[PDB]
Scaffold this active site. Structure first.
Site, PDB file in Angstrom:
ATOM      1  N   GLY A  24       0.815  -1.194   0.000  1.00  0.00           N
ATOM      2  CA  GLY A  24       0.000   0.000   0.000  1.00  0.00           C
ATOM      3  C   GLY A  24       0.855   1.253   0.000  1.00  0.00           C
ATOM      4  O   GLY A  24       1.998   1.235   0.462  1.00  0.00           O
ATOM      5  N   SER A  25       0.321   2.346  -0.535  1.00  0.00           N
ATOM      6  CA  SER A  25       1.058   3.599  -0.623  1.00  0.00           C
ATOM      7  C   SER A  25       0.075   4.732  -0.391  1.00  0.00           C
ATOM      8  O   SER A  25      -1.017   4.734  -0.967  1.00  0.00           O
ATOM      9  CB  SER A  25       1.739   3.760  -1.985  1.00  0.00           C
ATOM     10  OG  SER A  25       0.766   3.912  -3.014  1.00  0.00           O
ATOM     11  N   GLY A  26       0.457   5.672   0.448  1.00  0.00           N
ATOM     12  CA  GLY A  26      -0.375   6.824   0.734  1.00  0.00           C
ATOM     13  C   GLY A  26       0.448   7.893   1.402  1.00  0.00           C
ATOM     14  O   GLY A  26       1.662   7.979   1.198  1.00  0.00           O
ATOM     15  N   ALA A  27      -0.224   8.719   2.210  1.00  0.00           N
ATOM     16  CA  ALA A  27       0.464   9.771   2.944  1.00  0.00           C
ATOM     17  C   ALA A  27       1.210   9.231   4.155  1.00  0.00           C
ATOM     18  O   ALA A  27       2.158   9.876   4.623  1.00  0.00           O
ATOM     19  CB  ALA A  27      -0.526  10.853   3.375  1.00  0.00           C
ATOM     20  N   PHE A  28       0.802   8.064   4.668  1.00  0.00           N
ATOM     21  CA  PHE A  28       1.571   7.348   5.680  1.00  0.00           C
ATOM     22  C   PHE A  28       2.878   6.790   5.130  1.00  0.00           C
ATOM     23  O   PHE A  28       3.681   6.262   5.911  1.00  0.00           O
ATOM     24  CB  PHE A  28       0.736   6.201   6.273  1.00  0.00           C
ATOM     25  CG  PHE A  28       0.186   5.249   5.237  1.00  0.00           C
ATOM     26  CD1 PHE A  28       1.017   4.333   4.598  1.00  0.00           C
ATOM     27  CD2 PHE A  28      -1.159   5.274   4.896  1.00  0.00           C
ATOM     28  CE1 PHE A  28       0.522   3.467   3.637  1.00  0.00           C
ATOM     29  CE2 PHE A  28      -1.664   4.405   3.937  1.00  0.00           C
ATOM     30  CZ  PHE A  28      -0.822   3.501   3.309  1.00  0.00           C
ATOM     31  N   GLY A  29       3.097   6.874   3.814  1.00  0.00           N
ATOM     32  CA  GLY A  29       4.286   6.330   3.181  1.00  0.00           C
ATOM     33  C   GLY A  29       4.007   5.091   2.347  1.00  0.00           C
ATOM     34  O   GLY A  29       2.985   5.015   1.659  1.00  0.00           O
ATOM     35  N   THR A  30       4.906   4.108   2.410  1.00  0.00           N
ATOM     36  CA  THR A  30       4.779   2.876   1.644  1.00  0.00           C
ATOM     37  C   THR A  30       5.008   1.677   2.555  1.00  0.00           C
ATOM     38  O   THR A  30       6.042   1.595   3.229  1.00  0.00           O
ATOM     39  CB  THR A  30       5.779   2.860   0.489  1.00  0.00           C
ATOM     40  OG1 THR A  30       5.745   4.126  -0.175  1.00  0.00           O
ATOM     41  CG2 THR A  30       5.440   1.763  -0.504  1.00  0.00           C
ATOM     42  N   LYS A  50       7.040  -0.424   7.033  1.00  0.00           N
ATOM     43  CA  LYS A  50       6.512   0.899   6.734  1.00  0.00           C
ATOM     44  C   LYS A  50       7.691   1.860   6.604  1.00  0.00           C
ATOM     45  O   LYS A  50       8.354   2.180   7.599  1.00  0.00           O
ATOM     46  CB  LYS A  50       5.527   1.369   7.804  1.00  0.00           C
ATOM     47  CG  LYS A  50       5.212   2.864   7.710  1.00  0.00           C
ATOM     48  CD  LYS A  50       3.752   3.155   8.012  1.00  0.00           C
ATOM     49  CE  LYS A  50       3.379   2.672   9.387  1.00  0.00           C
ATOM     50  NZ  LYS A  50       2.402   3.589  10.017  1.00  0.00           N
ATOM     51  N   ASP A 138      -8.262   5.669  17.875  1.00  0.00           N
ATOM     52  CA  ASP A 138      -8.608   5.443  16.478  1.00  0.00           C
ATOM     53  C   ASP A 138      -9.062   3.998  16.260  1.00  0.00           C
ATOM     54  O   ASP A 138      -8.791   3.402  15.213  1.00  0.00           O
ATOM     55  CB  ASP A 138      -7.446   5.798  15.542  1.00  0.00           C
ATOM     56  CG  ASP A 138      -7.910   6.033  14.105  1.00  0.00           C
ATOM     57  OD1 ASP A 138      -9.132   6.151  13.888  1.00  0.00           O
ATOM     58  OD2 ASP A 138      -7.071   6.079  13.180  1.00  0.00           O
ATOM     59  N   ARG A 142     -10.987  -0.683  10.113  1.00  0.00           N
ATOM     60  CA  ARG A 142      -9.798  -0.532   9.272  1.00  0.00           C
ATOM     61  C   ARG A 142      -8.507  -0.693  10.076  1.00  0.00           C
ATOM     62  O   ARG A 142      -7.477  -1.042   9.494  1.00  0.00           O
ATOM     63  CB  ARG A 142      -9.812   0.824   8.536  1.00  0.00           C
ATOM     64  CG  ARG A 142      -9.315   1.998   9.375  1.00  0.00           C
ATOM     65  CD  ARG A 142      -9.776   3.399   8.879  1.00  0.00           C
ATOM     66  NE  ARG A 142      -9.728   4.347   9.999  1.00  0.00           N
ATOM     67  CZ  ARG A 142     -10.797   4.904  10.580  1.00  0.00           C
ATOM     68  NH1 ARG A 142     -12.020   4.650  10.126  1.00  0.00           N
ATOM     69  NH2 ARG A 142     -10.642   5.725  11.614  1.00  0.00           N
ATOM     70  N   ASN A 143      -8.546  -0.492  11.396  1.00  0.00           N
ATOM     71  CA  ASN A 143      -7.354  -0.571  12.240  1.00  0.00           C
ATOM     72  C   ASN A 143      -7.289  -1.859  13.061  1.00  0.00           C
ATOM     73  O   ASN A 143      -6.697  -1.884  14.147  1.00  0.00           O
ATOM     74  CB  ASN A 143      -7.283   0.655  13.145  1.00  0.00           C
ATOM     75  CG  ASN A 143      -7.015   1.923  12.348  1.00  0.00           C
ATOM     76  OD1 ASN A 143      -6.438   1.858  11.264  1.00  0.00           O
ATOM     77  ND2 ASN A 143      -7.457   3.066  12.860  1.00  0.00           N
ATOM     78  N   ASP A 156      -2.412   0.209  14.276  1.00  0.00           N
ATOM     79  CA  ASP A 156      -2.421   1.645  14.007  1.00  0.00           C
ATOM     80  C   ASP A 156      -2.452   2.453  15.295  1.00  0.00           C
ATOM     81  O   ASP A 156      -3.507   2.931  15.728  1.00  0.00           O
ATOM     82  CB  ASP A 156      -3.595   2.045  13.104  1.00  0.00           C
ATOM     83  CG  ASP A 156      -3.413   3.450  12.498  1.00  0.00           C
ATOM     84  OD1 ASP A 156      -2.792   4.320  13.162  1.00  0.00           O
ATOM     85  OD2 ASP A 156      -3.894   3.683  11.360  1.00  0.00           O
TER      86      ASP A 156
HETATM   87  C1  LIG Z   1      -6.011  -2.073   3.405  1.00  0.00           C
HETATM   88  C2  LIG Z   1      -5.260  -2.919   2.724  1.00  0.00           C
HETATM   89  C3  LIG Z   1      -4.586  -4.069   3.372  1.00  0.00           C
HETATM   90  O1  LIG Z   1      -4.715  -4.321   4.583  1.00  0.00           O
HETATM   91  N1  LIG Z   1      -3.813  -4.814   2.542  1.00  0.00           N
HETATM   92  C4  LIG Z   1      -2.944  -5.886   2.871  1.00  0.00           C
HETATM   93  C5  LIG Z   1      -2.227  -5.918   4.065  1.00  0.00           C
HETATM   94  C6  LIG Z   1      -1.342  -6.957   4.341  1.00  0.00           C
HETATM   95  N2  LIG Z   1      -0.670  -7.045   5.582  1.00  0.00           N
HETATM   96  C7  LIG Z   1      -0.277  -6.127   6.518  1.00  0.00           C
HETATM   97  N3  LIG Z   1       0.269  -6.646   7.634  1.00  0.00           N
HETATM   98  C8  LIG Z   1       0.676  -5.748   8.544  1.00  0.00           C
HETATM   99  C9  LIG Z   1       0.563  -4.383   8.373  1.00  0.00           C
HETATM  100  C10 LIG Z   1      -0.009  -3.957   7.182  1.00  0.00           C
HETATM  101  C11 LIG Z   1      -0.192  -2.527   6.881  1.00  0.00           C
HETATM  102  C12 LIG Z   1       0.146  -1.466   7.667  1.00  0.00           C
HETATM  103  N4  LIG Z   1      -0.177  -0.286   7.048  1.00  0.00           N
HETATM  104  C13 LIG Z   1       0.057   1.047   7.587  1.00  0.00           C
HETATM  105  C14 LIG Z   1      -0.732  -0.568   5.820  1.00  0.00           C
HETATM  106  C15 LIG Z   1      -1.211   0.288   4.835  1.00  0.00           C
HETATM  107  C16 LIG Z   1      -1.742  -0.270   3.680  1.00  0.00           C
HETATM  108  C17 LIG Z   1      -1.789  -1.647   3.513  1.00  0.00           C
HETATM  109  C18 LIG Z   1      -1.304  -2.496   4.499  1.00  0.00           C
HETATM  110  C19 LIG Z   1      -0.769  -1.960   5.668  1.00  0.00           C
HETATM  111  N5  LIG Z   1      -0.437  -4.816   6.247  1.00  0.00           N
HETATM  112  C20 LIG Z   1      -1.231  -8.017   3.425  1.00  0.00           C
HETATM  113  O2  LIG Z   1      -0.367  -9.008   3.794  1.00  0.00           O
HETATM  114  C21 LIG Z   1      -0.133 -10.059   2.862  1.00  0.00           C
HETATM  115  C22 LIG Z   1      -1.932  -7.995   2.229  1.00  0.00           C
HETATM  116  C23 LIG Z   1      -2.782  -6.926   1.946  1.00  0.00           C
HETATM  117  N6  LIG Z   1      -3.525  -6.873   0.724  1.00  0.00           N
HETATM  118  C24 LIG Z   1      -2.733  -6.826  -0.501  1.00  0.00           C
HETATM  119  C25 LIG Z   1      -4.594  -7.878   0.741  1.00  0.00           C
HETATM  120  C26 LIG Z   1      -5.939  -7.288   1.135  1.00  0.00           C
HETATM  121  N7  LIG Z   1      -6.614  -6.611   0.024  1.00  0.00           N
HETATM  122  C27 LIG Z   1      -7.802  -7.353  -0.399  1.00  0.00           C
HETATM  123  C28 LIG Z   1      -6.980  -5.243   0.385  1.00  0.00           C
END
Ligand SMILES: C=CC(=O)Nc1cc(Nc2nccc(-c3cn(C)c4ccccc34)n2)c(OC)cc1N(C)CCN(C)C
Length: 310
Positions: A24-30, A50, A138, A142-143, A156
């Site tokens: 994922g990519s946004g204002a929080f970074g990548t 992150k 928060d 979503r969190n 989060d």
């Molecule tokens: C909102 C989108 C989302 O949660 N996507 C996501 C997340 C993970 N795993 C994961 N594990 C720990 C932390 C994070 C994470 C932390 N932050 C801040 C994020 C920002 C955007 C996306 C993911 C993250 N993400 C992950 O691990 C294999 C896969 C996906 N997606 C590609 C699959 C879900 N998709 C159907 C949205």
């Protein structure tokens, strides 16, 4: 005053972990999916990294502070940080993503047992945070992240505040805030407590029981504080018996001290999780079932972060 925070902040070598794919990519970074291989330990740990302004660095370090200070099966924990030309937070990979996206994508195969167990697990996570005198500020679907369909964790901590030694509340400054999840007293007086977290927990449960609907859809956030003051609340989801909905409603009382405590939400949702079809009515419930990810073949030494201690 209060007890000393002896959590360890682990500083990671950039050569010790490999980014595999953008998540994922946004204002929080990548955020990247990746593997962390601490030198000389013969483990490969699936991680989310992150990567990332001098104020934006002060923000991600505060999150790292909070995440490093928690340790509970229902809260995401920090594996460490890496201080390169950019700052990177390395946390546990939660392979199924956010619970909000999960309930949207899998609405047709989510039974009552999963929904009520997630309620229990989030209450357990929030009760732990309350024991640590932490206010999340928060809490939302979503969190919450999905490690497995059977195991979710709160994440989060970008807004979380450790309450000072004799503080019962936190008074925020101004800014963009998630209005549709906030207790009334937080909307009006920027005041936050463990009991205002209870309010957002109620809203989070409502998101789950509607399989990811948006709360107060269409209504501008400007009008929310007025709607609540008139005594309106979110509506009873179709699958919810009155037992479950009454719990959500109690989380939305104006008097913060009359809302349930997280330790009571654990108890009540645990009772309901013992006979789930008595409390959520889902067509087809009794026949639903829910369950390479790194493009690397030699995963013989993979170890989940939860099994990787000290
Ligand atoms: C909102 C989108 C989302 O949660 N996507 C996501 C997340 C993970 N795993 C994961 N594990 C720990 C932390 C994070 C994470 C932390 N932050 C801040 C994020 C920002 C955007 C996306 C993911 C993250 N993400 C992950 O691990 C294999 C896969 C996906 N997606 C590609 C699959 C879900 N998709 C159907 C949205």
């Amino acid at each position: 005053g209060e007890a000393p925070n002896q959590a360890l902040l682990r500083i990671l070598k950039e050569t010790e972990f490999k980014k595999i794919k953008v998540l994922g990519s946004g204002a929080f970074g990548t955020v990247y999916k990746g593997l962390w291989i601490p030198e000389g330990e013969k483990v490969k740990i699936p991680v989310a990294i992150k990567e990332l302004s001098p104020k934006a660095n002060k923000e991600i370090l505060d999150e790292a502070y909070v995440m490093a200070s928690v340790d509970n099966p229902h809260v995401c924990r920090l594996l460490g940080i890496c201080l390169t030309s950019t700052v990177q937070l390395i946390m546990q990979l939660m392979p199924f993503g956010s619970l909000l996206d999960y309930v949207r994508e899998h609405k047709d195969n989510i039974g009552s047992q999963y929904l009520l167990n997630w309620c229990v697990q989030i209450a357990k996570g929030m009760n732990y945070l309350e024991d640590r005198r932490l206010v999340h500020r928060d809490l939302a679907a979503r969190n919450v992240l999905v490690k497995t369909p059977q195991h979710v964790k709160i994440t989060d901590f970008g807004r979380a505040k450790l309450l000072g030694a004799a503080a019962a509340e936190y008074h925020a400054e101004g800014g963009k805030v998630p209005i549709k999840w906030m207790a009334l007293e937080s909307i009006l007086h920027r005041i936050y407590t463990h009991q205002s977290d209870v309010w957002s927990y109620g809203v989070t449960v409502w998101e789950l029981m509607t399989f990811g609907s948006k709360p107060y859809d269409g209504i501008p956030a400007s009008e929310i504080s007025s709607i609540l003051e008139k005594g309106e609340r979110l509506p009873q989801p179709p699958i919810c018996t009155i037992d479950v909905y009454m719990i959500m409603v109690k989380c939305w009382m104006i008097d913060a001290d009359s809302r349930p405590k997280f330790r009571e939400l654990i108890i009540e949702f645990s009772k309901m999780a013992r006979d789930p079809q008595r409390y959520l009515v889902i067509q087809g419930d009794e026949r639903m079932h829910l369950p390479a990810l790194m493009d690397e073949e030699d995963m013989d030494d993979v170890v989940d972060a939860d099994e990787y201690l000290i």
